[PDB]
């Protein structure tokens, strides 16, 4: 009996159970019920002295228990770790037990249920039906998940139900209330198992005159006054609010696989439940698959901060309390969690997710036709944009141009769309989807039939946006990847932090290496630098910190000791005894930063003879992500191209999350030394590269690297010679000036300032600066920031100006990646002139020869004459500001102005010229111009 | 005594409730129509009788969650015949600090310093937690105003009170508790009592005399 | 739970008496402040155990007291008063005497009308206290209140110090007493101004001097060795040979346990006359160059440092030879 697992959930009642929702080969759904236990790892002597005897105990072999408490030491006589080796056992307790000196207590019982039984949460199995007794139609009982989930077959494909919904409510306040305002429309995107994608919008009768209701029934709609009277094949339906809410309740109680919605946990589902209770006095009944437990829909919060101060804000996320297996998903919470966008409205999210390009076909009065094809613009973007156009109404051209469509044509490939926008000169225009300029508040004060139907369209498009976005973010495959990398149920994948996802891989590891890390001592905190700020080519490190915790073999259990020295003349004695004792390269002594004064040494000693748990974890993660990148490079199907992409991304996310998890106090990977160590090794490596990257190159085969290629942390006899021999054309002159970098970049100042001469030389340097200057597993990569991409501040303060791999006949673009100046709630008058002031700001940084005089006189004259011309002419319109109102006196040297034109810009006008000083090399003209700008 | 639209058509309060009482009127007016759609307990005539009690001379709030569905009285945990469930239990479990056992009644409304507070000011008679939807806003508001004049909070509830810090826009000493509505009353393992006393010292308030409330 | 009541009562108790608390006491103070906020959202030397029992008994003789004010001066645990809310001083003093503790005596002329302490009421008081102990104390007790407002007499002036050395405080123990300019050895009370404080000889330093005794005066604005001084600094014998030293250390049973648990920078700065305070502040000011765990070169970038290196190499060598 073959099944594929969709979701794992537990019953929250008197009886603890664990359910498996799975789809068979032929599309039938079967649930399986496992007794849920508590799991305790207990040594042999404890097990033998147990009273009463445990319910079930299975051996675990000889595990070594390692005490990983870090004890500082003021002399070089460090006692070795306390490491026992005992025969362990696994105790399975139906009801919780208080058992003393039991270890491995940081791992959930669901992780144990998976690992001990050898079950992947997303695998596809051939269940030995000899054990699954039947309790009711569609539910089996499995007492022995060991011998029933034995034979594991390869992954096959199954059908999956869905429901993407959205509602709209009457209002005159900012947000409606369940008591005063009734819901107007209610749209759905019901995707059955068979594949039937049915869209339909229910409209509220009771806001219409009977005359317009009859007009609508004449026009095209259906009318229902009962529940059994509706059918989802009709695209528009008119009904009261009681039948509307009863249909909503009838849908939400179905066993869909997912029920997706954007911020539909806080607003939509809550509004529906509350209003249904008010109107009809009914509730939404989620029944358990064994029909032996029914709950009512009730939304509950879950604060997410792993550290909460006083008077702060934690991202409270609302969840449904359903217990039937359906994964009530909310795209809003997922998007806020996974990606750090600029804003999180559905409109802007769409406008940045569904994009394409459109070439003008035939202009006209108040109209314009755009074509978008695969062979012309980026492959796949035209197809997704044509998938969004089937329901959308208001298409957005490159900027601030929102146009109501007139006619849309979905070709076999591409799209042709007519827009009601005034004439535009340029032939190409980038089309993004969605801002929908409508006065809903005003549209509700004159509600009639045409407006009812307009809003029904507005609502069905918003209900289908939650499907286009659900497919864009590949959530259905990221879920099944996370539910297998992190050994967790498909429902608990995005609900938790790193400290919770990391425990499945870690527990699977500790049963190979047979270690058990314990801590019989409390931990102390020492605050640190949580974020770096700083200010040509761009080479980055291949996941620097996993590579460092693998190079240095950093771990809590492979720490020999932290030899510290109070003051001078003891650090020296200790340094000499650390040069003789603990010698390279089996031990590595890293000079961490002093944890408390008075101390000047804090040297940490790591033994590099056995692979710790953390470095072995990281190596497995890197190896699997590499395997999946390879398997994706060779993927032929369009489904495998998604499965393997999701798996690779999952391994990336779980690998990058370990370094932050070592400095996190209440974590299963905590070690103050290793955290403070890999931060110092990485910094030393970065500074080493910066040291040897300031070297000139001439008479090809020099690239002197500016210094001897001396390996840090020890000598290694690696042909230490600055002058190397490259393989590029002979006559060259370029020097690379100072490089700064943060941790995942080292920008070197190339003295060429042109493409086609950097891409080649940099691609041949990166091969020569990661095979001749780096040592063990510190690889590098390469990109290029074309013509001084504005480096205002730390990482997320730049423009895009992309030049990745090709520079011959290549197409760059320079819109933005700032995520720093795009947000409203600010002025609208004087700024947005950057859209006109950038063409002269991007051009004052792209000359190199006349650049100095041009930029200085340009900033000076431009800003002084902008001040005077705004004070005299009153020219700039009121459009936007675009920076992340205010009033200020103008008498001395809804957003509407005053009588003196120097009201509120005298601060932004100097903050702007303050932001843009770190892109030149002038130290006298720039700062003096700044000082004189005040008068 | 502000005059609301629906029952009881007016709410007489104490002089220390005006920092809130104004918006309570609209909060109650938008929900009253459905609120009095069913006869609740307490009756609509004693919804806000606890709004008569001053908050200056009080420093501890033993916050229940919902009144006794079988005819609560508008003052939490009170008993006109001392024959209820949780009140006799807490009187018993508190009969050990004072060391006395003789009581004809024990209301927290006469312990000078403590104020019994019902989170949800009403419930459908016979049902529990059945008027939460009608009360959420006013309940959060009344609690936030009760905590800005006193400083201690003893939520008599195990899981009913789980996110109390979220529904409070200001830091106040939020002690928690375990609902003795369960079996064994669960009050023996945890000595919740006298923790209020210890915590009333770090700002020099007087300890609660839990004997002040018996009937003699 | 009751377990929580334990640390809560401890928090309250220690919060009541921060003034007399220890380092681990203020540690528990802040740790319990945090353990409370994260659940509810808002010295002297060692006193013997045969003395600890009597002190625990005397703390109960009158429970109005919070701590035991033991004056730790010149390796003497001499108390001047027991701060007990109701207990008289003479009763606690008689109890301590029955236990074997150092209680002082009072000799003064009392007046039925309180007169303001002045030149006479401090000089004659110091001269009439008749106590043969080293202290500038002028002591009194008033009936009706337990507050302590002590008086004393001296005058601040300048003098040029003699050296950085010691005066024999006890048996084979020379505790540092920098001799005054006239010749007297000053009476240093607390280890703050007693280790090597202002070791500077011939320096014009301002101190609060009197006719016989005195005290050190800190600034207001801007702010001699050998094997001999090692053998008596841990009290085994007098010596001038390393073999003698190590052999006498072997002959001991507890002195070896004392050396085993001390560092060599400590032991070499403690038996030299300036353990930590400004020493390290200078040893960090100097670049160093050593070999085989023996300093051989130094460069500034106090006075007993050359000889300090000379005895430091010696203690390192004897520790190596013994261990």
Residue numbers in the entry:
A (entry chain A): 1 to 535, 545 to 893, 931 to 939, 957 to 998
B (entry chain B): 3 to 218
C (entry chain C): 3 to 44, 102 to 282, 313 to 390, 404 to 425
Extract from the study:
The MPXV DNA polymerase holoenzyme, consisting of F8, A22, and E4, is vital for replicating the viral genome and represents a crucial target for the development of antiviral drugs. Similar to vaccinia virus (VACV), another well-studied member of Poxviridae, the DNA polymerase holoenzyme of MPXV encoded by the viral genome contains three proteins: the uracil-DNA glycosylase E4, the processivity factor A22, and the DNA polymerase F8 belonging to the B-family polymerases, which correspond to D4, A20, and E9 in VACV, respectively. Here, we found the two different states of DNA replication holoenzyme from MPXV, which could be induced by the dsDNA to transition an inactive hexameric form into a more active trimeric form.
To our surprise, the addition of the exogenous dsDNA leads to the increase of a latter peak on gel filtration and it still contains the bands of F8/A22/E4 on SDS–polyacrylamide gel electrophoresis (SDS-PAGE), which might represent another state of the holoenzyme. We then collected the latter peak fractions and prepared the cryo-EM sample. When supplied with an exogenous dsDNA, the hexameric form of the holoenzyme changed into a trimeric form, notably exposing the DNA binding site of the thumb domain. The trimeric structure of the F8/A22/E4 complex might exhibit as a more active state due to the loss of the interface between the thumb domain of F8 and A22′, thus releasing the dsDNA binding site of F8. Once the dsDNA substrate or another factor binds to the holoenzyme, it can trigger a conformational change into a trimeric complex, releasing the DNA binding site of the thumb domain. However, we could not get the DNA substrate-bound structure when using both peak fractions.
